[PDB]
Design a protein around this ligand. Structure first.
Ligand SMILES: Fc1cnc(-c2c[nH]c3ncc(Cl)cc23)nc1N[C@H]1[C@H]2CC[C@H](CC2)[C@@H]1c1nnn[nH]1
Length: 161
């Protein structure tokens, strides 16, 4: 499958997936009905200012190796990948005031609403994703997008263009 999401072209290089309509609770305990893809899948993400290799299991990001134009371009690709992963911590990072999802679908699907939400401000997302201890050529990236050699956002690596 070769599809479009958040301005990136996704192309599956390994794995398979079946769909399942499921109910998810946000950090605001809001119920969203999402189309969950089940199975280990590997994708290329090709955009205009960033490219990445995404390794993912059902509602879990295994690894994301990002290459881009700059910190903003890479953060963008990172956000799309985290929303696409359908991970619980991404969903649970939807919390606050006005931070709700219009349940009549209309303009955007839940995945497109989650995306439009994290594009506005990724602080809660990146900060609620987690950090892990960390290879030459690939650096780690902290939730504030600072490159580090000792810690990175879980599963996230930044490769040189
Ligand atoms: F065509 C597609 C073919 N395959 C996938 C797909 C394979 N593995 C996956 N794992 C997680 C997710 Cl999130 C999707 C996938 N996704 C497609 N499109 C998705 C895709 C997300 C939302 C929109 C637009 C692009 C669209 C959709 N999601 N739910 N209904 N439609």
């Amino acid at each position: 499958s070769s599809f479009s999401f958040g301005g990136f072209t996704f192309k599956r290089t390994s794995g398979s997936s079946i769909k399942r309509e499921e109910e998810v609770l946000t950090g605001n305990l809001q119920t969203l009905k999402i189309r969950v893809h089940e199975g280990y899948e590997e994708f290329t993400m090709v955009g205009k200012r960033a490219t990445a290799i995404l390794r993912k299991a059902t509602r879990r990001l295994v690894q994301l190796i990002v290459s881009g134009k700059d910190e903003q371009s890479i953060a963008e690709a990172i956000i799309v990948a985290m929303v696409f992963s359908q991970e619980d911590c991404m969903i649970k990072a939807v919390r606050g005031d006005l931070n709700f999802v219009n349940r009549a679908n209309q303009r955007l699907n839940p995945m497109h609403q989650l995306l439009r939400h994290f594009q506005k401000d990724a602080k809660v997302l990146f900060q609620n994703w987690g950090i892990e201890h960390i290879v030459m050529g690939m650096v780690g990236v902290l939730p504030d997008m600072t490159p580090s050699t000792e810690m990175s956002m879980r599963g996230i690596r930044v490769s040189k263009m």
